[PDB]
Swiss-Prot record, chain B:
Official protein name in the record: NADH-ubiquinone oxidoreductase chain 6
Subcellular location: Mitochondrion membrane
Positions of transmembrane segments: 1-21, 66-86
Signal peptide: none
Assembly with partners or alone: Complex I is composed of 37 different subunits.
Source species of the chain: Yarrowia lipolytica (strain CLIB 122 / E 150)
Gene: ND6
Function as written in the Swiss-Prot or TrEMBL entry: Core subunit of the mitochondrial membrane respiratory chain NADH dehydrogenase (Complex I) that is believed to belong to the minimal assembly required for catalysis. Complex I functions in the transfer of electrons from NADH to the respiratory chain. The immediate electron acceptor for the enzyme is believed to be ubiquinone.
From Swiss-Prot, chain D:
Annotated protein name in UniProt: NADH-ubiquinone oxidoreductase chain 4L
Membrane topology per record: Multi-pass membrane protein
Subunit structure comment from the entry: Complex I is composed of 37 different subunits.
Catalytic activity: a ubiquinone + NADH + 5 H(+)(in) = a ubiquinol + NAD(+) + 4 H(+)(out)
Family: Belongs to the complex I subunit 4L family.
Main location: mitochondrion
Superkingdom of this protein's organism: Eukaryota
Taxonomic lineage: Eukaryota, Fungi, Dikarya, Ascomycota, Saccharomycotina
Gene Ontology MF, one: NADH dehydrogenase (ubiquinone) activity
Length: 90, 91, 469, 89, 486, 179
């Protein structure tokens, strides 16, 4: 007994314009491939290879470049130099 | 039954706890039980009229807390209007 | 002047017919407007935070409470215009949004009970006024009695309000058993040192707070807010929140409260992650109230919180009131009306709203980016001025949990937008009947306060500097 | 304070663990209110004032109007459904 | 009365152009082109010999809420420029008609909406560079995001929804901790200001805390390696003008915010933390430019390219050197030129015609479109760090400034010249050469409007490339300003 | 300075407390449930709650006290190590290795972020801005936390930052003077 009112007269929605003809034959294999590649993260799972790359690029490489960066803060000036002059501060 | 027993113990003891003000928790509870001293009632001849308890309630409901009697009238009004207004079925 | 309105009104409603009821509410609407306009000037009494105690250590009147009073009148002028005015002149909307005979009676008695808390100094004034407003929410819930859900919700609300009234009464009499006193004015900052009033004042605070919707006991209030119809629930959501919270913010009995701090953390957590996978709009919209009542429980821990509170109050009241008024307007555009009392429920029903009345989506967007805290809108300065009080006073883990809770709560706010700006196959091209001019002007006014209300931030603070300091 | 606290706690647990009907829940609420009364009236007698007796005589009336309101709420609940469930509302 | 009558006239003219012309896009182009004329007349009256903030105006003061305010007490929102602001404003304002140009025929359904949102985003990021409070910087810093959400969601690829979400989510989530840090500054100093704030000193234990909240927000917005995560998808599923305004202006806005907000009052903090910034900067140059090699999609490659160039850019900012600061500015402005041209080449000339962005379809674009392939190669080589283009001036002075402060971080920072060439020329030779693709049917040559946009965005790189001294007249104050060498 | 902890005493106190919380939550799980349940299904259909409370209590307080005792200072890192042990105990209930590693790392990071802000839900009274000296220094003094100055001592800059990068105990100008 509750229906939206009679004075609506709602019509269809177009997007309008010119039917651009198909400039591309889509490949089913290429489209399935690319849809698998962009949405890879919803099927990603941890394995030993994932653990190896996640260890080395997220943990080991920041720690190595970290140690190298904190050791070498005020070591080197080369600004005006001479023979027999050490360039390391330490 | 087990949550009954746990809640009996905790709610009973913790209801007995706030009558007391030592910082130590066990001293709060034992002051609940130390009541066996007998209060001494002395006769003072300072009062000349039979102000009963109901007279004093009628003096404090009516002068010092007259507004509480009047907001209470609004509450009694609501207790009339409400049950009526539910159980009418007007027309 | 609410008293004179109630005394005149119920005699007047006893003599009017059923068909007169609508027009009666129109009268009361204008009445409350001329209590704002012609009686505002009483703010001149409250210079330099001069406080009065009236009826003999019974009601305390400061200007904090005067502002709460003015806010409650403004939102009632809105809610009363929602009942008293037609949306459209159809044969449909007359049987969907129709007031009962005694509805405005319970409305004004409820506002009376909600004002006699914020103005209250005594504890028996507190208890009688909580009882008055609790009865009024009982009867406003049960007044649309030809509904299965509303009657079940009124019974549930009766028993869960009875427990938390007897917990307040037990805390008042527990406080009396250690001090022959009724006021928190007796406390005066020496007594709290040498007296273990932690457990009393905290239990009093809790028994006052669980009626708001703080989170260990939050499920029953979300059930009442989903079961009640769509007009009753924009009142019973707003009023006990602002009344009970502006009581507890005024009297500062839970400072360094570890229990209030746990329950604030737990509220911000299970409010933001509670309402995520939900499909009903009043549910979705009632867990927004749980998180935004969480941001208040933080301010209870504070000393001197009267800026952050009041600004975020009128923030939440305008934003609250506007987002409930928007989904009243979306009912014309849905393809499926069920459940005469509650005509829109599921949040996917407003799906094609941008193709039919796109500026209703502009309205909906503007209010929902203000719930998130987007800086051109008024909700952001509310969250900002809460943050300025939290970080001032040592609550550093509370602050980052506030932020994570705001980020999680933005998801189900933006779900409203996600659903609203979508494609719909069958769009409206022309409508015969249009929306009530005086009623859609209220939504336009409630937006222009949210959009262009960051203008007056400076002015308000200078006015805030004079009347509260 | 023993009689009021024991009436309050036993009535509270009888309210909470009620699964058998609804009128037991109403009467457990009223026996709670009696217990809060008892604690307060004793504190008035021990402190030599009517003050807690003032809060007592007000909460008598408020317990009354709570009964009147809520039992009309039950009649409204019963109007559409001609039986009240045993497990609850 | 005069400045109100101007607005009452111009809104009336707007309503009339609406009533008679269905689009607005003519009036929007006209307004943004007038903004160009106005800002260059402000550039003529700009005094370069003063370090000062020249054109100051207060909004939303107490004594005058609607308009300008001349009072002895100020609590509104301040606005004004030095050289350092003004450079970006120039780079801002010449970008704004071009994106309004950039979708002149693509958007068919709801024109007036899209062009209003694009112009409104451009105006907000105009006013981002005028601001002078911490709060008035931050109000407009986040005014963009509803407009970006509504723009990415309504228009885009099939995956508009997730991209609009991420541009709200990550950007918001970093900006909230930015707000935490702004609040902690505003309750200690009791003044948010871009003028006085180098004078105040904070404790080192107190600078130590404040600086994390601003720096992780700049980590989100200039996408450094821990969160560089929204950037490829919010490009790859954007429409055209949203992607151009994003990668030309929003990333440089956070490059501006690391100068304006952090380097004046976090100096004694900032020295203790330059190795952490160098960890994250080198680690976002190496590891994002290496992830470019394995990409199936085509707008996503130019997105990760933008990550690698901003990773080069920010290690000139934190270099504590005159060279590094000037190189970061010339990198930021030149990348703001060269990069929206690349998003045009993937998005305008190549998605409007074929509507699929997978790389595997596109081969041998030379033999049917010679002058497009001409563009693709000379915009490829302008991206790498091949000189006389302004991108190399930024890369070179940034790598030199990063070699000052720590030489070993500059040694592995310098291989970015190689790593930035590998993926870009690997894309360029796949697009440019081969037999023309059997999937692509032949379409139109590049039109006059697209060639117009391209010619402007390539001349404006070449002028900075041949002579970077043309904008040193703005910066020679602000290159010396942020240096802390006791 | 500090005082070492009794690992055995604090551990057995927490073990008793976790046992009590396990019994209370098992009773609350019985009484809030459906189906045929009796007095003996408290520890039968328990869902293993008493193992959760017991293991979390013992592991957190043992790792917290042991890490505080071997480091000989009390700071936010001890909460990180103890929260990692708590995440190890909570993550062994899901008998999976990458799950377990995730529970350890993320629970340890969350508990370290907790313990770094003071390890308190509520506020500290003397440490907040409102109860601490703030604003400018009135005269020259040791600038405490929450205070602003105009000029800082250069000896403090050499002591706190270092003697290296562009930073020196004498400015570069008057180090190069004609006499
Ligand atoms: C809001 C907070 C957001 C901030 C954190 C950001 C999220 C982190 C990632 C979350 C996640 O991945 O979960 C996926 C995971 C998904 O569930 P699933 O469907 O069963 O597994 C499918 C996955 O793909 C699983 O399969 P898989 O093989 O792909 O992945 C294995 C592993 C992968 O998860 C990982 O991310 C591990 C790899 C990280 C290594 C990176 C190293 C370099 C850095 O997934 C897990 O099982 C994670 C479980 C750990 C959840 C950690 C929750 C911490 C509590 C946060 C407190 C707030 O989430 C859960 O397991 C939910 C568990 C139930 C919720 C637990 C919440 C209880 C909190 C108790 C309090 C804890 C202490 C609080 C502090 C106390 C003092 C204040
Ligand atoms: C040093 C060694 C340490 C031990 C760890 C290795 C570890 C954790 C790595 C996560 C790293 C965390 C990253 C955090 C970064 C650090 C900060 C990787 O375990 C994975 O190893 C992979 C390769 O070995 C396997 O991948 C693929 O397998 C084949 C499918 O077709 C393909 O043949 C292969 O090609 C694929 O590769 C996975 O199946 C396996 O889950 C766990 O190994 C262990 O855990 C369990 C749970 O699963 C494993 O599961 C079992 O397998 C079922 C039958 O399989 C059984 O029914 C079931 O009883 C049980 O569930 C065990 O086996 C065990 O090994
Ligand atoms: C934006 C990214 C997220 C960043 C999260 C921020 C959390 C960072 C916290 C840092 C901070 C608040 C400052 C934050 C303000 C900005 C907040 C930003 C936004 C907040 C969301 C809390 O510092 C906490 O640090 C913890 C460990 O690190 C300690 O843990 C505990 O350790 C055990 C000790 O007893 C506990 O027993 C144990 O229970 C815990 O284990 C706590 O003691 C301490 O409160 C610092 O506060 C403190 O700093 C110290 C200096 O030394 C200050 O002393 C000053 O200096 C001395 C003379 O020079 C003099 O002593 C004194 O005269 C002077 O006063 C204090 O004034 C105080 O104020
Ligand atoms: C409903 C129907 C009516 C039912 C009635 C029956 C029971 C009614 C009682 C229930 C009342 C309602 C319960 C409410 C919850 C309890 C509230 C509660 O704990 O406050 C505690 C009391 O600290 C005890 O010392 C509390 C210790 C209490 C002892 C525990 C119980 C003993 C059980 C023995 C086994 C205090 O909080 P708080 O965070 O401000 O306290 C902190 C902090 O603890 C202190 O260190 C600081 O010094 C102080 O300033 C403050 O910052
Ligand atoms: C500090 C901030 C605090 C408060 C600020 C809030 C509100 C501002 C206060 C007062 C605002 C006062 C407004 C009065 C003037 C506003 C006004 O033009 O009339 C009305 C709405 O009128 C209210 O809706 C009057 C309703 C007033 C209730 C406002 C509550 C919100 C709009 O005209 P309208 O073209 O639609 O009205 C026409 C016309 O009157 C009829 O003849 C036609 O038959 C019919 O088609 C109708 O459309
Ligand atoms: C002829 C009388 C006209 C009737 C006016 C009735 C108004 C009812 C509305 C109540 C809620 C709406 C917000 C009102 C804000 C008053 C601020 C104030 O001033 O608040 C201050 C401090 O506020 C606070 O803490 C914070 C509140 C912040 C409000 C945030 C919303 C800002 C956007 C709306 C305000 C600007 C709109 C102006 C449009 C031209 C104290 O309050 P007060 O004691 O100075 O009251 C003033 C007496 N007044 C009403 C007669 C003048
Ligand atoms: C929604 C986000 C939240 C919004 C918060 C911020 C609201 C901004 C509202 C826009 C209005 C700001 C722009 C207009 C104000 C400046 C007008 C002006 O008159 O500037 C005065 C200034 C000096 O003038 P004066 O001191 O009086 O002396 C004159 C001597 N010949 O003269 C000058 O120095 C020249 C000033 C040039 C200003 C250039 C600004 C570029 C952008 C202009 C359009 C801004 C509209 C943006 C709309 C989107 C909203 C962000
Ligand atoms: C979410 C989205 C939020 C959008 C936020 C946009 C904020 C827009 C607020 C605009 C306020 C800022 C106005 C800029 C001031 C420009 C100006 O000066 O206009 C002239 C007049 C005041 O001029 P005057 O103070 O006399 O100074 C002139 C000295 N040569 O100024 C005036 O008379 C005021 C005229 C503008 C009134 C507009 C009110 C809002 C319109 C809707
Ligand atoms: C002897 C003395 C030593 C022992 C004393 C230790 C006391 C600890 C008591 C804790 C008991 C655990 C609470 C509990 O029973 O929770 C169970 C109840 C329902 O949970 P359940 O149905 O069993 O599991 C379904 C999962 N969806 O869950 C509930 O809904 C109950 C509501 C939560 C209990 C209140 C706790 C408030 C604090 C929340 C922590 C927030 C932490 C913030 C950080
Ligand atoms: C977009 C999303 C943005 C997300 C941003 C990250 C949010 C946080 C994620 C979780 C971080 C977990 C942090 C673990 C740190 C635990 C800890 O206890 O740190 C303690 C450490 C020492 O502080 P202290 O006790 O004062 O001792 C002084 C000794 N120099 O304190 C420190 O030295 C600082 C250690 C933290 C370093 C930064 C962590 C990342 C930020």
């Amino acid at each position: 007994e509750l229906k939206p009112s009679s004075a609506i007269q709602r019509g269809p929605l177009n997007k309008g314009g010119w039917d651009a003809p198909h400039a591309l034959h889509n490949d089913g294999a290429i489209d399935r491939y690319a849809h698998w590649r962009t949405f890879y993260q919803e099927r990603f799972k941890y394995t030993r290879a994932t653990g190896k790359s996640t260890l080395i690029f997220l943990v080991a490489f920041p720690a190595l470049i970290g140690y190298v960066a904190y050791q070498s803060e005020g070591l080197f000036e080369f600004a005006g130099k001479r023979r027999g002059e050490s360039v390391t501060t330490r | 039954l087990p949550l009954v027993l746990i809640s009996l113990i905790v709610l009973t003891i913790s209801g007995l706890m706030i009558y007391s003000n030592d910082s130590i928790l066990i001293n709060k509870l034992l002051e609940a039980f130390g009541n066996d001293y007998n209060t001494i009632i002395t006769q003072d001849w300072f009062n000349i009229e039979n102000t009963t308890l109901l007279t004093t309630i009628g003096n404090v409901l009516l002068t010092n807390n007259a507004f509480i009697l009047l907001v209470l009238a609004i509450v009694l009004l609501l207790g009339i209007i409400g049950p009526i207004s539910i159980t009418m079925k007007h027309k | 002047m609410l008293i004179l309105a109630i005394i005149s009104l119920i005699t007047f409603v006893s003599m009017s017919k059923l068909s007169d009821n609508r027009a009666i509410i129109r009268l009361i609407n204008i009445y409350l407007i001329l209590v704002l306009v012609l009686d505002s000037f009483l703010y001149l009494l409250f210079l330099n935070n001069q406080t009065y105690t009236v009826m003999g250590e019974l009601l305390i009147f400061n200007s904090f409470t005067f502002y709460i009073d003015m806010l409650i009148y403004f939102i009632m002028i809105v809610i009363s215009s929602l009942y008293g005015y037609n949306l459209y002149n159809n044969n449909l909307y007359k049987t969907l949004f129709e007031p009962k005979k005694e509805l405005i009676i319970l409305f004004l008695i409820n506002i009376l009970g909600a004002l006699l808390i914020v103005h209250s100094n005594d504890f028996i004034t507190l208890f009688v006024a909580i009882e008055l407003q609790s009865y009024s929410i009982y009867l406003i819930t049960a007044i649309y009695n030809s509904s299965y859900k509303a009657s079940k919700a009124s019974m549930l609300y009766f028993f869960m309000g009875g427990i938390l009234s007897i917990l307040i009464a037990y805390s008042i009499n527990t406080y009396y058993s250690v001090l022959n006193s009724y006021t928190l004015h007796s406390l005066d900052s020496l007594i709290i040192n040498t007296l273990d009033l932690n457990l009393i004042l905290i239990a009093l605070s809790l028994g006052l707070l669980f009626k708001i919707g703080i989170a260990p006991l939050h499920k029953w209030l979300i059930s009442i807010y989903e079961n009640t119809p769509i007009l009753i629930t924009i009142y019973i959501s707003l009023i006990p929140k602002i009344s009970i919270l502006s009581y507890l913010v005024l009297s500062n009995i839970s400072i360094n409260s570890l229990v209030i701090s746990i329950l604030a953390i737990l509220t911000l957590l299970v409010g933001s992650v509670g309402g995520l996978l939900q499909i009903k709009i009043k549910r979705l919209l009632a867990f927004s109230g749980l998180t935004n009542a969480g941001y208040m429980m933080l301010l209870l821990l504070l000393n001197n919180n009267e800026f952050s509170y009041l600004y975020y109050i009128t923030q939440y009241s305008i934003s609250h009131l506007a987002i409930f008024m928007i989904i009243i307007f979306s009912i014309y555009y849905i393809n499926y009306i069920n459940n005469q009392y509650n005509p829109i429920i599921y949040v996917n029903q407003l799906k094609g709203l941008i193709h039919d009345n796109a500026y209703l989506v502009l309205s909906m967007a503007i209010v929902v980016f203000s719930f998130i805290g987007i800086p051109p809108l008024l909700g952001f300065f509310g969250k900002l001025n809460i943050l300025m009080s939290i970080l001032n006073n040592g609550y550093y883990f509370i602050s980052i949990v506030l932020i994570v809770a705001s980020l999680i709560s933005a998801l189900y706010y933006l779900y409203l937008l996600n659903v609203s700006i979508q494609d719909k196959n069958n769009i409206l091209i022309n409508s015969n009947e249009t929306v009530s001019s005086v009623l859609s002007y209220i939504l336009s006014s409630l937006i222009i306060l949210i959009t262009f209300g960051f203008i007056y931030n400076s002015l308000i603070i200078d006015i805030f500097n004079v009347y509260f300091n | 304070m023993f009689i009021g606290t024991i009436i309050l706690v036993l009535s509270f647990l009888g309210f909470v663990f009620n699964r058998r009907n609804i009128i037991l829940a109403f009467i457990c609420l009223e026996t709670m209110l009696l217990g809060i009364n008892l604690i307060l009236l004793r504190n008035s007698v021990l402190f030599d004032d009517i003050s807690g007796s003032l809060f007592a005589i007000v909460i008598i009336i408020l317990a009354g109007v709570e009964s009147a309101i809520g039992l009309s709420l039950l009649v409204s609940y019963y109007r559409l459904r001609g039986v009240i469930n045993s497990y609850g509302i | 009365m005069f400045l109100t009558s101007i607005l009452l006239s111009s809104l009336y003219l707007f309503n009339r152009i609406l009533a008679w012309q269905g689009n607005v896009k003519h009036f929007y182009l006209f307004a943004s082109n007038l903004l160009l004329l106005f800002i260059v007349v402000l550039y003529i009256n700009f005094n370069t010999f003063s370090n000062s903030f020249q054109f100051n105006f207060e909004l939303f003061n107490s004594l005058n809420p609607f308009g300008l305010s001349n009072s002895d007490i100020s609590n509104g929102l301040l606005f004004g420029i030095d050289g350092l602001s003004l450079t970006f404003i120039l780079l801002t304002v010449l970008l704004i008609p071009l994106t309004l140009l950039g979708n002149w025929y693509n958007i068919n359904f709801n024109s007036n909406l899209y062009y209003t949102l694009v112009l409104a985003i451009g105006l907000v990021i105009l006013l981002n560079f005028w601001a002078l409070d911490y709060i008035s910087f931050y109000i407009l810093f986040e005014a963009t995001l509803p407009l970006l959400f509504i723009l990415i969601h309504i228009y885009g690829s099939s995956d508009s929804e997730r991209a609009s979400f991420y541009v709200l989510m990550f950007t918001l989530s970093g900006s909230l901790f930015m707000l935490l840090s702004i609040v902690v500054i505003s309750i200690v100093l009791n003044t948010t200001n871009f003028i006085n704030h180098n004078l105040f000193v904070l404790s080192l234990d107190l600078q130590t805390i404040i600086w994390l909240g601003l720096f992780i927000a700049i980590m989100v917005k200039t996408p450094l390696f821990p969160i560089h995560v929204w950037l490829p998808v919010v490009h790859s599923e954007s429409p055209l003008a949203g992607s151009m305004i994003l990668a030309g202006l929003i990333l440089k806005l956070a490059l501006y915010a690391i100068l304006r907000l952090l380097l004046p009052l976090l100096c004694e903090a900032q020295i203790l933390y330059t190795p952490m910034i160098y960890i994250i900067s080198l680690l976002t140059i190496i590891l994002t430019s290496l992830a470019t090699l394995r990409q199936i999609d085509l707008k996503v490659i130019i997105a990760y390219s933008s990550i690698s160039h901003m990773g080069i850019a920010i290690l000139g900012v934190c270099s504590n050197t005159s060279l590094g600061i000037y190189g970061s500015i010339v990198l930021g402005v030149a990348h703001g030129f060269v990069s929206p041209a690349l998003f045009l080449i993937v998005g305008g000339i190549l998605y409007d015609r074929y509507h699929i962005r997978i790389v595997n379809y596109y081969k041998g674009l030379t033999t049917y479109m010679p002058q497009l392939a001409t563009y693709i190669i000379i915009l490829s080589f302008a991206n790498i760090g091949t000189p006389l283009t302004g991108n190399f001036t930024g890369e070179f002075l940034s790598l030199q400034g990063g070699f000052i402060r720590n030489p070993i971080i500059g040694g592995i920072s310098c291989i970015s010249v190689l790593l930035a060439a590998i993926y870009q020329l690997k894309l360029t030779n796949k697009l440019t050469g081969g037999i023309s693709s059997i999937y692509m049917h032949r379409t139109n040559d590049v039109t006059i409007r697209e060639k117009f946009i391209m010619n402007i965005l390539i001349i404006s790189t070449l002028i900075i490339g041949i002579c970077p001294q043309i904008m040193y007249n703005l910066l020679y104050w602000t290159v010396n300003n942020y240096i802390y060498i006791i | 300075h500090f005082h070492p902890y009794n690992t055995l005493g604090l551990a057995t106190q927490s073990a008793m407390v976790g046992l009590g919380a396990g019994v209370v939550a098992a009773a609350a799980r019985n009484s809030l449930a459906t189906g045929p349940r009796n007095i003996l299904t408290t520890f039968s259909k328990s869902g293993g709650v008493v193992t959760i409370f017991t293991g979390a209590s013992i592991a957190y307080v043992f790792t917290y006290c042991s890490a505080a005792n071997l480091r000989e200072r009390k700071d936010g890192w001890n909460h990180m190590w103890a929260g990692a042990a708590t995440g190890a105990v909570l993550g062994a209930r899901t008998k999976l290795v990458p799950a377990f590693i995730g529970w350890t790392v993320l629970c340890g990071a969350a508990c370290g972020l907790f313990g770094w802000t003071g390890a308190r839900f509520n506020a500290d009274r003397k440490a907040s801005l409102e109860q601490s000296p703030k604003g400018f220094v009135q005269e020259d003094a040791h600038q405490t936390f929450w205070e602003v100055v105009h000029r800082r001592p250069l000896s403090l800059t050499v002591e706190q930052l270092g003697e290296g990068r562009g930073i020196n105990a004498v400015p570069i100008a008057t180090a190069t003077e004609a006499p």
